[model samples]
Target: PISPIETVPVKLKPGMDGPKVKQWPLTEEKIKALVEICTEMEKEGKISKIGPENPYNTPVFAIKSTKWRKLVDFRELNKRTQDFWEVQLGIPHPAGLKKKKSVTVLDVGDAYFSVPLDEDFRKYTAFTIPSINNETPGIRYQYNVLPQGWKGSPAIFQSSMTKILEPFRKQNPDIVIYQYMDDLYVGSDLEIGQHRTKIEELRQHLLRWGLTTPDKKHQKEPPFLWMGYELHPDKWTVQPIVLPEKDSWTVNDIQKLVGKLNWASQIYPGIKVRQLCKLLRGTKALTEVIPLTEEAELELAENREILKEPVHGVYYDPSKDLIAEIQKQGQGQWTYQIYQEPFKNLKTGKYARMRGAHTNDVKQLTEAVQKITTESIVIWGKTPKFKLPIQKETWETWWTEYWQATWIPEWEFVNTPPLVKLWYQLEKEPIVGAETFYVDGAANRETKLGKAGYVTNRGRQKVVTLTDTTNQKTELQAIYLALQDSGLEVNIVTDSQYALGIIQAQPDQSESELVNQIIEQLIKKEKVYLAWVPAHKGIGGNEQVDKLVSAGIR
Candidate 1:
């Protein structure tokens, strides 16, 4: 809860420009706003609204009567009615809720059981409760106060199940049990033993209540697809399955599915729903149909398969649970002090606290860092958790330090002399300079071509290195092979910063693109340097070696 003023500032130089401005022709926000306006116009029933509060303003017109009819006319009293309904039956406060605990055994008592009421009547009654006085006899029903099928059903379910799972919930705060309509999605921090035990406990409780989960829906082996997304065996996923026949569904069918899909994310993971949101948006004409192209058929094929599966990564947030656990880990003074900071910005009116966080509540910094690292590793493949030359036996130690040393890199300009030297050496005569490097390093594609040796030479001679020839790797091998006979490593140094980083950073081949390149080049004892020459400078030794390499490739 530190003050913004007290926090470290991201300093800006006087009159200094920030990041480069991109020339994006269209924005999703503008498109969404326009679509909303168009949809509203269609729903209003009137073809157009001509009179404006300001006469100078242009009148807006609706093109479709169908759209106009759907226009929501929220009168003040109606809005109040809606607000009153929402406040009483709280909107699902899933934001920033924690997962249940890990490694904890939970207990169930007879007191946790509630008689199931028909969903429709339960919802209707909850809505009607605000209009009636508190003392009304109809409101006195025990089932009326409890959640039935409203938006907060998951939260209410959690609350109800807590009494039964209380011991486990307290002990294994990193695991959680989520409920959908007749379906229960259980998740944990990849702790296999904890997950299995917690799930079994919850299953027993449900069975005791005369509630039966369908065997097909009852998941134990994971990468379980839950809530329209795939959950890793280690992580949680809650996704619904879409049958193959559903791919050809009509717009209305998709719209209905979209609503249900949105609901799935509320109960499970948000990313699960996000994957299919565009498809859902398409049902409402918010997205464009595929245009015919060479890739159209390919895209359609992909979509057909994708549609047959529920768009997932929508409902679940183990991170939310992790964050909650982290907060709970904070001790007295640290906890109070952490949350003492402003939860919302006064000037910008932005939320200072993350979604679902208690105002001014501070999570344990160490745990927070660990959770971030774990989640990041799960999300992004890259990690600083191991040395460039990783030791098989010391992976845990490597990862620990790798995480500690993580920091943002400072951008630096590349040196041009070595690149120019290598370029001229490759060509027998002088060649032209390039404008810049293709990437941000020294010998990039955009490097300038105005040097003495490269002032005018221009001809098509492909100077590719032959040794680096894997489909997955860059052309560095072919270039390296061409350089094999040159015998001028002193003059023509390969600009291999990018290639080297890939090799040293990831010894494992599972995800690395340069695995082969790294293996082949490692034996050559190629020395790496931060500074290198551009390809076509007037440097004599580099120029001669460059010519041999270029001629060899040709």
Candidate 2:
């Protein structure tokens, strides 16, 4: 069998620019570590000396894990490169997997460095390291194998690994294999002997491609750790791998905790541990140790208690008393409970109780929502608010076109139509200097006639009488007359609800010709207002309009 696949040249996009390089001073310890790595790689024939031509000087920093471990920054090159390999690691949910006799997980050690790079592409990976003891000038070193900080290295490695594993996958159909980058999980329903045989076969195939699995990173069966989750075959529940919290935490400690919780939430379908970790997201100063708030500390304790036990059944329903208590408080209390009832996972066909909390405090409320399903049904008092039904993407195409065809300029918040507050202010303020016009419309069913009348602030009367017209039409006619050549600050006071409803109707719902005319005329004026008053009220202006309507009826 061919051992270690040959290095392939990198194909750059046409007209791509050469690498942009920047240099930074490294500490003495970092410089020593870099030289040591270069020397070891050179001895193994993985790297060699290079001249100044096409050189890229990259800054290096020591990783916190070990003194000898260092990393190169290639962010500039990453931006210029396009990721072409589209295949993703299809990691199935643990609950969906059928009962298996054995599960074997493997981790590839120094995975990226094991893949070889083409000789031509090696020059681009060149980086300069200063000499020790002033013995010689700075030397440039180039990698023969794939380097850590390259833009397209992960895609290339994944493509190579996929090709190497294809034959084994086809051979054993019963054994399910899943991979994320270099980590591999092999699972089977077969007996121990057969399972071990398949795992050994996979290890041999990986060896041929220069991939080595460390003994410490190999696992067999229940309580397997994959993707930062502890999967126990004994129980269906998945638990996050959390480190024991120290008495005090640095910013880095908080960040690491948040990251682990986030990963756990994705794998485990319904755990809400992540909400407790959100409080640490904005932490930056390492020197300043921020202790968890009392609420956060309490949540952490609850999370630990949850992880200690496992739920075997699919559904968990809270007691009736708990549901009633939570509903009584609604979403307005700080110490609210989550009452879980029966619900099914649409994809898995598994049922489970989903509980959520309520808090009047905005920050606490924000955190609590993240714990529950967004569309979960919420019960407030006796009424049950169903989840907002999800619609298919195809159904939204009409709306997309409609928005494009009849788009209006986006209005600012201040320009948005005022709600009840603005109306209340208008009612309280006096109408001094305001051009007030009282309008009234009368309709007679016996005669099939409609009459409209408007009285101005100076008691000037204008009346219109029409045959075979409805009251709504007459009311719109009065508004149209008042809008004609009206000066700024015009107020049309009316007792007709029909006229007001038509005027406020959305543009699509409004149909009356008179309503449209009034709107167009009002838009041309600087300011206009609508005020509603009760009929037969003692207001002098409305009474005059009422008398005119009575006269028209005669």
Candidate 3:
């Protein structure tokens, strides 16, 4: 068959006499693969036997990835090669071409060896192998055509192809064809029924120039396979990126998994990740195995959660039901692309998706959401389409026998012993013109250390470390210690909800004698104002008292 002659020649820098670096230590399998590759190159006329005394003999090595390949060690040769930057990479982005009605891709597989090299430049591409099919040792060979290992190969081939395909571009001005080295991708907004003629014509044009398209890659219709991604009429997805099913991961394995996840997201960004990275936060090295911790498992579990959702953009079908109902108001018709992510439930073992999304806007309407809706939604103005049979919300308790025995054994039980009463209410504002004291406690059961403290306005404070107690009892002691110190007109604020209830004594749950004494203080000062303040929330007085508990422990 005929081939295109390259006009641009490979050039090298002067006086780069590099050392004759020996070939790498290879095993039996590697030698066999190298021999096979060299045999194929000989048959294709890509390489030919050269003299053994050739001074520019580079080393050839075998590497295995998806398959075995022989790579020439052209480091020294490349260092002396003249640099050229006229190479044209892929022109159009896949993003813009998603708008095209049809995209067809073509692979010019023989791009590198298609153009024969200048006779004088072939000696510099000479490489020596230890054996030729293990029959002859120290045999030298040189490339007859452009070698891919050379830095100047891509530029030379690209320029030559551009010149050869100039006629095709000039004739089809309207048809957009992007050339990334040897791969050709056709993006046309024109109808595919009429577009097949342009593709066929382009194929014929390439054949005329001695560049034949592979029949395997030449698609007749839409959904073209280009590079590693499957390109569709509307959206582009990975040729299906999936992680390997691994029982356990090494540090290197985790690192590789994270990198692939990040790279795939960049290629087709429809998801997010974080927890896995956080697990790798303090990792010092990539050696050894990585066992699954709660954080690691949660991150993987989060990955499972995300996978339930669409990893690619929505592909609309006319026959399928719309999950998000269409709302029309006269000429002001609104369209919604409501995509739902289904998840496997633990209790019901069923998959479910949701309807509608809102941002606690009920908060703005109600002024607050404490007693209002927990997971509530509000819709208005005739969007009754959302009124479809929704998932029922319900709850049930576990067996009662499992509850009573599960009481803390270390917690000295106060079974049926307190003859007392308590008060319960939510106070809006603090009582004005009264002395206020905020009381709180902290306890470490392992160390058996209990610290109780109280903070007042202008720095009146009391902090004491109790010898040993439970966290609940420590808070109670903190409340008791606080009330005793305050004045007759006292307004005490306690973050502990239990401590607030325990103030009116005689002790219903009576393990502690200290609890009974609390009722006497309030009874002594009949005008004392006892109030419940938010503990979990930031109540101003409670924070200072809470702040002192740790210092007291120390």
Best by TM-score: 2
- What TM-score number comes out for model 2? 0.50
| TM-score versus the correct structure, for each prediction | 0.26, 0.50, 0.47
lDDT of 1 at 95: 23
lDDT string, candidate 2, 387-487, tens digits: 21112231133224322232211111111111101111122343467788899887787787978889988657788888987777777788788878357
The parts of candidate 3 lying over 4 Å away from their true place are 1-5, 14-54, 60-71, 86-93, 118-120, 127-141, 190-194, 216-222, 225-228, 243-249, 263-270, 284-299, 309-311, 314-554
Candidate 2 lDDT score relative to the true structure: 0.57
| Span of ten consecutive residues with least summed lDDT in model 1 | 344-353
Q: State the lDDT of candidate 3 residue by residue for 53-97, as single tens digits.
A: 777767788888389988887887888787888675333333224
Model 2, residue 367: C-alpha shift (Å): 22
Off by over 4 Å in 2: 1-3, 6-9, 12-14, 20-31, 60-67, 86-91, 132-136, 215-221, 240-308, 312-554
The alpha-carbon root-mean-square deviation between model 1 and the true structure, to one decimal in Å, is 21.5
Reference-based lDDT, each prediction:
0.31, 0.57, 0.57
